[PDB]
Amino acid sequence: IPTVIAYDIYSRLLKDRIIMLGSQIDDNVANSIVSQLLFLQAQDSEKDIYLYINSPGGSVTAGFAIYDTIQHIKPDVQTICIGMAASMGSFLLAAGAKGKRFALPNAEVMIHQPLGGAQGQATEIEIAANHILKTREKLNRILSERTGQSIEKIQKDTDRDNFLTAEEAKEYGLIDEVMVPE
Amino acid sequence: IPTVIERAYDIYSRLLKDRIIMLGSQIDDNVANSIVSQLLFLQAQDSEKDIYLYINSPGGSVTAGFAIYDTIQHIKPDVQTICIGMAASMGSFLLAAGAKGKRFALPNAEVMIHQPLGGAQGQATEIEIAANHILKTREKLNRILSERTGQSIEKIQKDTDRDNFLTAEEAKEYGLIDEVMVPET
Amino acid sequence: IPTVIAYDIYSRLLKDRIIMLGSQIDDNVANSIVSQLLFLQAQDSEKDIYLYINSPGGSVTAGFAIYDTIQHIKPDVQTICIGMAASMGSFLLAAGAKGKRFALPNAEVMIHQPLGGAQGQATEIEIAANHILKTREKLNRILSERTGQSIEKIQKDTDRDNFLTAEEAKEYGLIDEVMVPE
Amino acid sequence: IPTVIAYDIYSRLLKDRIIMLGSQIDDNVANSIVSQLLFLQAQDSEKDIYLYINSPGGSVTAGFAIYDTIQHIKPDVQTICIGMAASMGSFLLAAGAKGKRFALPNAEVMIHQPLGGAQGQATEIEIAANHILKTREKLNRILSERTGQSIEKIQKDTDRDNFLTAEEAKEYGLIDEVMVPE
Amino acid sequence: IPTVIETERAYDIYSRLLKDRIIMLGSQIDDNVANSIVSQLLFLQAQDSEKDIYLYINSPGGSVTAGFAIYDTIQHIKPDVQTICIGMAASMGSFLLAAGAKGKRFALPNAEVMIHQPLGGAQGQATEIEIAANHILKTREKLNRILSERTGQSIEKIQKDTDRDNFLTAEEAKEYGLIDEVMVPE
Amino acid sequence: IPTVIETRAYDIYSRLLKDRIIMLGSQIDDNVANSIVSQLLFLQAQDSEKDIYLYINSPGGSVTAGFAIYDTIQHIKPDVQTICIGMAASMGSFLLAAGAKGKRFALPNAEVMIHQPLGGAQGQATEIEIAANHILKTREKLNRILSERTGQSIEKIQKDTDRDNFLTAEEAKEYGLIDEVMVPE
Amino acid sequence: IPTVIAYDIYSRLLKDRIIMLGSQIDDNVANSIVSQLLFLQAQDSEKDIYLYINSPGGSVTAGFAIYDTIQHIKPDVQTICIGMAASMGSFLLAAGAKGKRFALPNAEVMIHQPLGGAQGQATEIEIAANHILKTREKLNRILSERTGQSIEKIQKDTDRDNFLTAEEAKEYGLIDEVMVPE
Amino acid sequence: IPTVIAYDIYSRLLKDRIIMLGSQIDDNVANSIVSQLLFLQAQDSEKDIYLYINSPGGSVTAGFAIYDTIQHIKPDVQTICIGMAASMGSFLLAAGAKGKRFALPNAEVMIHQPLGGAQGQATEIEIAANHILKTREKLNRILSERTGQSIEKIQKDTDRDNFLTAEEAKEYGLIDEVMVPE
Amino acid sequence: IPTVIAYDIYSRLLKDRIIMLGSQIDDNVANSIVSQLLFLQAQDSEKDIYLYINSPGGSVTAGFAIYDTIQHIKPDVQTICIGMAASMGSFLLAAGAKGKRFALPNAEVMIHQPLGGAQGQATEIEIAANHILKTREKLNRILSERTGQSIEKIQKDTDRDNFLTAEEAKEYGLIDEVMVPE
Numbered sequence A, C, D, G, H, I: 001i002p003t004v005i006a007y008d009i010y011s012r013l014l015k016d017r018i019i020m021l022g023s024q025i026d027d028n029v030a031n032s033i034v035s036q037l038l039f040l041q042a043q044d045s046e047k048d049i050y051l052y053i054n055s056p057g058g059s060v061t062a063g064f065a066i067y068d069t070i071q072h073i074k075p076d077v078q079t080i081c082i083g084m085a086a087s088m089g090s091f092l093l094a095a096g097a098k099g100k101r102f103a104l105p106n107a108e109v110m111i112h113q114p115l116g117g118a119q120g121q122a123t124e125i126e127i128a129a130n131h132i133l134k135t136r137e138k139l140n141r142i143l144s145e146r147t148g149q150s151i152e153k154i155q156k157d158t159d160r161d162n163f164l165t166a167e168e169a170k171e172y173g174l175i176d177e178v179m180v181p182e
Numbered sequence B: 001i002p003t004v005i006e007r008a009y010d011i012y013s014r015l016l017k018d019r020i021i022m023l024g025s026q027i028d029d030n031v032a033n034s035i036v037s038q039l040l041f042l043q044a045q046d047s048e049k050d051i052y053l054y055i056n057s058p059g060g061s062v063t064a065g066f067a068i069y070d071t072i073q074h075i076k077p078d079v080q081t082i083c084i085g086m087a088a089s090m091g092s093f094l095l096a097a098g099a100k101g102k103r104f105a106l107p108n109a110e111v112m113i114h115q116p117l118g119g120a121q122g123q124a125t126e127i128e129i130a131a132n133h134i135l136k137t138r139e140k141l142n143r144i145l146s147e148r149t150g151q152s153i154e155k156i157q158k159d160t161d162r163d164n165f166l167t168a169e170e171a172k173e174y175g176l177i178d179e180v181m182v183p184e185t
Numbered sequence E: 001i002p003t004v005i006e007t008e009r010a011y012d013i014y015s016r017l018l019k020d021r022i023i024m025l026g027s028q029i030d031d032n033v034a035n036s037i038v039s040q041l042l043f044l045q046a047q048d049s050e051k052d053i054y055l056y057i058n059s060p061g062g063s064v065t066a067g068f069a070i071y072d073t074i075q076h077i078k079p080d081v082q083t084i085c086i087g088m089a090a091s092m093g094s095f096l097l098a099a100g101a102k103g104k105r106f107a108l109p110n111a112e113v114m115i116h117q118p119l120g121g122a123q124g125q126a127t128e129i130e131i132a133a134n135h136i137l138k139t140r141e142k143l144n145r146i147l148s149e150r151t152g153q154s155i156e157k158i159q160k161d162t163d164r165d166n167f168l169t170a171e172e173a174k175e176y177g178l179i180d181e182v183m184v185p186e
Numbered sequence F: 001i002p003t004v005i006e007t008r009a010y011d012i013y014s015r016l017l018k019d020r021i022i023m024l025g026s027q028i029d030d031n032v033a034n035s036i037v038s039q040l041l042f043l044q045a046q047d048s049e050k051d052i053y054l055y056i057n058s059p060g061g062s063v064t065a066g067f068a069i070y071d072t073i074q075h076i077k078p079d080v081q082t083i084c085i086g087m088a089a090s091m092g093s094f095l096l097a098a099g100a101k102g103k104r105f106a107l108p109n110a111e112v113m114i115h116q117p118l119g120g121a122q123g124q125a126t127e128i129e130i131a132a133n134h135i136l137k138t139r140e141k142l143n144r145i146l147s148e149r150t151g152q153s154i155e156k157i158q159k160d161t162d163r164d165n166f167l168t169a170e171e172a173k174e175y176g177l178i179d180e181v182m183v184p185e
């Protein structure tokens, strides 16, 4: 990772209120992004923040740590998909400030239902199944609110992996604009 | 495994000549296929004479256990069940499935009952299908166990929530067996 | 495996025209079952054969080796599900002689779409995908013929794992009768 | 982990009296949090401290190192659940200053009985069982004091994994308020 | 394993011993070993319900439930089952040595007998560990009660003497009541 | 591990060491002992009169590494307070008991565990005898010191450490392993 | 292993009352040798048995199973070392009938103390040590009786690995004669 | 391994007094060869035995079990090297009856010093070193007697791997004749 | 490893002429200790150096690098055993300046013969054995000189692991004094 003069390149972007979500979402990545959001709010509660998303998704609870911190803070958080946003990464792309959710033209967006597992006694499997179904209902309700699509349509469209172009993601309501090059 | 000469037989084949079938391992499809074949063979040799099913098993596959269960109910001879050592999980289900009045345990045998085990990985809807299947399987097992023990389905559900170890005398009181086979002085 | 006097127990059942399909279906299992079917036809071309099925399925081509040998020979092949018939095992259960397909009352039948995999260049993945889709069409067409259900219904009902009781399998047309105990 | 100007982002939050419990609880995590608590008390014995919790739980003794240090020091320790608090993480959430325990709206709280293991001679297994049962009695007694729920209710409600929404965690007495976004 | 031919029938050496009513318990006790020994005991009872059976024990023990399959079959059948320890009888092997017909439990002079409490494990939730602990404690109570009956020692003494590995010579096993006689060479 | 900067940058543990707090927060091996011994000797050189605070959250470990720490504590002039937070087990509980008389503490929910030493021996009969004699002499040395520091008899310590023995903070005070439970205001 | 006509070659030697101890001594080898000794006594109570020893030793309890069976039975058991007899193998060589213990001229005999191990609590290590020391005292006392050497000399001479030629083994009293070729 | 009518091919050769040493020499191979030698002596004490050698050698004590049994029995044992005789295999080739040691023309003979290992305390390494040096002295003394070469020459010529043609092995005195084809 | 103000704790002790030998002795540890000794001689050729020993020993040549550097330099090197000094660690403890070799009261000292290994040809094993025996003679001669015990006594007392208390090590001549606490 190069240095500019001294900042590593990512720390230099954070100085200009750009946060990089560029990996699988796990608790470490979420804790870092949450801390960056809270720090940027403290530096300036009015100026936009820019969340770059190039992520295959990951942990749903880690993604909700980021989601709730975005909604909590005062500054608008713009989202921009570059490369790919899949699964919980596409959920966070849709969670950006209204009118300020973007993708570049060749970015890939993918939506699908949550994944998990359960081993053990029948009653333990039932608890695990009830939990993942309730988690899917929670994700679909918020995605319905942020896209304008019905919960029934989101349920059908996420039954299996669903790949969208940037223009399809705009038509769906996951983003507001394709950022076309000059 | 030793051989006896009467015809030369391995010791298990010699017991099968006297209508004794050994369920002495974890229940998998291979064990079930062997026991099903033995039951059908013994019915063909003599449709009236009892068969003796020895059980020393920690259980195993529910579907493999139902292959044995359904074959026992299908054939004409009574199938006596005897628990020696241990009958756990699907092994205790099969012990309870013997001919009425002919389900036994020796005095220091261990019987254990509990809910079925399994697992699922994948999409939420795949986990839901797997959960619904294992819950329906537990309902099926509990209904039959209620019929064969005389206990209510509600009681069987409570009593199998966790591992429940029974002595031979406790298994008789519960209705999983009819008698403890006490040794002659 | 016990001996009866001298036959191993499975060879004794074959003397009474009973074939055991009691394992995952691979080429070795199929080759054995095909050989047994051809031998039994040669011993007596008129007397029924009994195919016991307790199988989680397996290879589709190995299953079609058994299916085509059943249809080729002159004797009726009865099928009986004891324990479980899943995937290609349920296909073979449905392939028995009309009126002579059975299950015992607590036997489990499961139907679902074929599984596979492909790695490599885009064009290699396309060839593999086209092959498994054509295989699914072939399975569904034959299952429609043997059950009386439409291809559209079979496609919907096999999208995910679908567990049937013996009575449900009779209602579906996968078997003719539940063999209830005296 | 980015730098702000020089602090790593987590060290910058600690300058504003924010401690991150963002991983599984082991002795290393506990020792670090204990040290941070004692340092912040020394800097200012009156000003609140903020404990962020995004944790699946972990070691009960490591969790009690954190619990007893929170109760020992003079400043109030606010707790906030973001993402998830499970097992000993939910215990620590409930341990925050009365009136200053929070969750964000989509945070997950899970409560369950302690896990462990025992191998060896019958008398060794008896010692291990008695120890884990006494540990569960200690956890339930403290959680009863902090939630207002009876020990009998906590015992029943933690027999298996019990997932709570933020609002359910407030109703239970694990938190005081859901921190709703403006 | 060698073959012997008697005039003509060919036997592996262990099958030839079984023809003379000798059963070999010569390995760790698991369900497969127990199923074989149980089958041999039932077969020998059917061949002759009156003639003694000889159970050779050279075993480090093993599964308690597999051992109780053997124990209960010994008590069930009509013939006396002599037990003889050669080499070693440890843990559930020493329990089976003590279970032979009264007056017909033997050891050769340099055989090792070891007694100790049962071993096991549990992993999982507190309530699962409690169920596992209660089960192994009840199993130890059952073992100790039977060993008290077969040796003449009190349950309190058996509990103390099996807290840790306790190695006995053949003569010490006789003094304890685990065997009746040391078979001293002529 | 976070850094604190005072108008000097310290990792948080180095900042605690500036206030004479040493962290024994892991399994005791030679590396941990060498670090703690160096810290004790440095703190004595900085101030020979001011108390040192040894935080203990440890499952124990090496007996010889623990005796490196024990002997350094007794050697130096300053009193070393000991405080158990979380857990002190095995050699960690021995070191808790080794703090300055009247200055051994535990927080209320801390766990203390005492047990006999663990080890191994492999080889010829005479090599096993040497190893056994050594671990028995090591146990007697530990028990003699624990008797001195708790006021309990060697025979009581031997009985109470035969198997794992878990104590609450209040039980550890009653036993003489600590002087006070540090109750919160 | 070749067949002679039908016996495998070892079974043909057993017909002539020759038992082969030709491997490491474990419980399986001891059970086999014990069974062979008891069978040979039953076939002929008067005729000598020949125990061939080419063994590096092994389990002390398995070796004592063989030793006690040799002393129990009525026939004399000659011992002959060919190749090597080490550790418990040399103990069994010395245990043959008085006057009928042999080695061929280039055979190797090795004597040494018993090996073992213990891991666990100090009291467990003490029990293990006391047991191996008592086992060594028993072995050395029997070797003193069968060689004519003092217990003190046997203890000194077995402290470390001690290799003997056939002639040295005769001089020591471990064998009676070197079987020199015609 | 084919059957002739019924014998496996090696058992058929043993019926004509031919023993195959065709593998690495370990105790199992030695025990088998010793048993075959003793059986053939019992069938006919006067008729020659033929020992085929195609072996890379192996255990020195296992080789001495074979060597001493050859010298013990009354029949002459011819040796024939076909393929290769190395290390203890070349020692056994040289041990055949005087005038009846052969090789086929393209057979390879290799001689070299014994191999072993020693691990542990200085005094244990010393015992192991003294043992392997004494073993080498024993091998060299016998090879000197059987070849007519000096012990000093054999020591020098076996310091490293020394490969001989059949004709060179005859010149050395390891064999008596090269068996040239008709 | 903590910092004091800036030095890591071990570098701060080196500033006060204290060298820590606190691990197994390998070439890396020896090279570091040798460098520290040469640096301290340069900093002050007259002032004592303090070598702390808590070591299970290790490489004999690495230990002799340390030993010879101690004897080469002008300053007295005090040695102090804390925790344990075993094998080459106890050799180095005995190598400190006469009158300035110490142990704390509960420190363990263990002496024993050198360990090693050799695998290969007889002549390679002989070279390895002669080397380890010469190494033991060199160690014993120096230990006799430094303790005042005879070489014969040192040989007997190091045949097996020999554990000494601090007081016993003083009686033996391995240290001069037990450093008793005030």
Ligand SMILES: C[C@H]1C(=O)N(Cc2cccc3ccccc23)C[C@@H]2N(C(=O)NCc3ccc(F)cc3)CCC(=O)N21
Pocket (backbone or CB within 6 Å): A012, A013, A016, A018, A050, A051, A052, A080, A082
């Ligand atoms: C265009 C707009 C926006 O959409 N982004 C999102 C974004 C994030 C990461 C990578 C991107 C790549 C391509 C396109 C947009 C990317 C950030 C950008 N910002 C800047 O470029 N700021 C100067 C700046 C950048 C880096 C730096 F180190 C210093 C200054 C902040 C001000 C602003 O309006 N924007």
Ligand SMILES: C[C@H]1C(=O)N(Cc2cccc3ccccc23)C[C@@H]2N(C(=O)NCc3ccc(F)cc3)CCC(=O)N21
Pocket (backbone or CB within 6 Å): A034, A035, A038, A039, A042, A069, A072, D012, D013, D016, D018, D050, D051, D052, D080, D082
């Ligand atoms: C709102 C309140 C609170 O609940 N927290 C907890 C908290 C912790 C971690 C992440 C969170 C994310 C979302 C919401 C609360 C979060 C900390 C916060 N603090 C600040 O935001 N302080 C400015 C600040 C932050 C970071 C920084 F680097 C400099 C200043 C301290 C003063 C205070 O009242 N609060």
Ligand SMILES: C[C@H]1C(=O)N(Cc2cccc3ccccc23)C[C@@H]2N(C(=O)NCc3ccc(F)cc3)CCC(=O)N21
Pocket (backbone or CB within 6 Å): B036, B037, B040, B041, B044, B071, B074, C012, C013, C016, C018, C050, C051, C052, C080, C082
């Ligand atoms: C009842 C009917 C049938 O449905 N089967 C299928 C079947 C196969 C495998 C296991 C089964 C278990 C339970 C129920 C049916 C089973 C075989 C059977 N046959 C026999 O039982 N024949 C005597 C026989 C069996 C075995 C044997 F070794 C000798 C004879 C052939 C004649 C016939 O009509 N039937």
Ligand SMILES: C[C@H]1C(=O)N(Cc2cccc3ccccc23)C[C@@H]2N(C(=O)NCc3ccc(F)cc3)CCC(=O)N21
Pocket (backbone or CB within 6 Å): C034, C035, C038, C039, C042, C069, C072
């Ligand atoms: C029909 C024709 C043929 O195409 N085959 C090939 C074949 C091979 C293997 C499996 C097959 C399965 C299905 C269809 C053909 C199969 C062999 C068959 N033969 C027999 O069926 N011969 C009786 C026979 C079979 C087996 C047996 F054990 C005894 C007799 C030899 C005589 C002959 O013309 N044929």
Ligand SMILES: C[C@H]1C(=O)N(Cc2cccc3ccccc23)C[C@@H]2N(C(=O)NCc3ccc(F)cc3)CCC(=O)N21
Pocket (backbone or CB within 6 Å): D034, D038, D039, D042, D069, D072, F015, F016, F019, F021, F053, F054, F055, F083, F085
């Ligand atoms: C109360 C007393 C004591 O018992 N300890 C032990 C201790 C050690 C580790 C964690 C603990 C957690 C909870 C309770 C006691 C803990 C240290 C403490 N000290 C301080 O708190 N000193 C200010 C201080 C701390 C850290 C820091 F970075 C700066 C100053 C030194 C002065 C003193 O009397 N004490």
Ligand SMILES: C[C@H]1C(=O)N(Cc2cccc3ccccc23)C[C@@H]2N(C(=O)NCc3ccc(F)cc3)CCC(=O)N21
Pocket (backbone or CB within 6 Å): B014, B015, B018, B020, B052, B053, B054, B082, B084, E038, E042, E043, E046, E073, E076
């Ligand atoms: C007593 C009754 C019974 O409950 N069993 C069940 C049983 C099965 C396996 C092991 C057992 C061990 C202990 C006790 C019962 C055991 C079988 C037995 N049978 C026999 O013993 N038959 C003679 C026989 C057995 C074996 C053999 F090889 C030859 C004949 C069939 C006739 C009969 O009524 N019984």
Ligand SMILES: C[C@H]1C(=O)N(Cc2cccc3ccccc23)C[C@@H]2N(C(=O)NCc3ccc(F)cc3)CCC(=O)N21
Pocket (backbone or CB within 6 Å): F037, F041, F042, F045, F072, F075, I012, I013, I016, I018, I050, I051, I052, I080, I082
């Ligand atoms: C007492 C004497 C001695 O025997 N040692 C050896 C020693 C080494 C390592 C750990 C030990 C633990 C306990 C006992 C002795 C220990 C070093 C000590 N020195 C000091 O303590 N010097 C102040 C000092 C220490 C550390 C530091 F960072 C700064 C100054 C140098 C001056 C001196 O005479 N001594």
Ligand SMILES: C[C@H]1C(=O)N(Cc2cccc3ccccc23)C[C@@H]2N(C(=O)NCc3ccc(F)cc3)CCC(=O)N21
Pocket (backbone or CB within 6 Å): E016, E017, E020, E022, E054, E055, E056, E084, E086, G034, G035, G038, G039, G042, G069, G072
């Ligand atoms: C002496 C007595 C007894 O205690 N045993 C137990 C025993 C079992 C296994 C190995 C043993 C080794 C040493 C000593 C006893 C051993 C069996 C023996 N039996 C025989 O020896 N029977 C002839 C016989 C044996 C083997 C054979 F193949 C044919 C016949 C049955 C008749 C009898 O009273 N006894």
Ligand SMILES: C[C@H]1C(=O)N(Cc2cccc3ccccc23)C[C@@H]2N(C(=O)NCc3ccc(F)cc3)CCC(=O)N21
Pocket (backbone or CB within 6 Å): G012, G013, G016, G018, G050, G051, G052, G080, G082, H034, H038, H039, H042, H069, H072
């Ligand atoms: C010479 C004497 C003896 O010391 N042995 C021991 C022995 C055992 C194994 C390998 C040996 C190799 C070399 C030298 C002795 C060997 C057995 C031999 N016996 C025979 O040779 N018996 C004929 C025989 C052997 C094998 C066979 F298959 C048929 C007959 C039994 C009768 C007898 O006195 N002896």
Ligand SMILES: C[C@H]1C(=O)N(Cc2cccc3ccccc23)C[C@@H]2N(C(=O)NCc3ccc(F)cc3)CCC(=O)N21
Pocket (backbone or CB within 6 Å): I034, I038, I039, I042, I069, I072
């Ligand atoms: C004695 C002579 C020499 O043979 N060496 C080689 C040497 C190298 C490494 C380790 C050694 C250990 C023991 C003995 C020699 C060692 C270097 C030494 N030098 C110094 O000691 N220079 C002061 C110096 C050393 C280290 C330091 F950090 C500062 C100054 C340079 C000047 C010189 O003549 N010599």
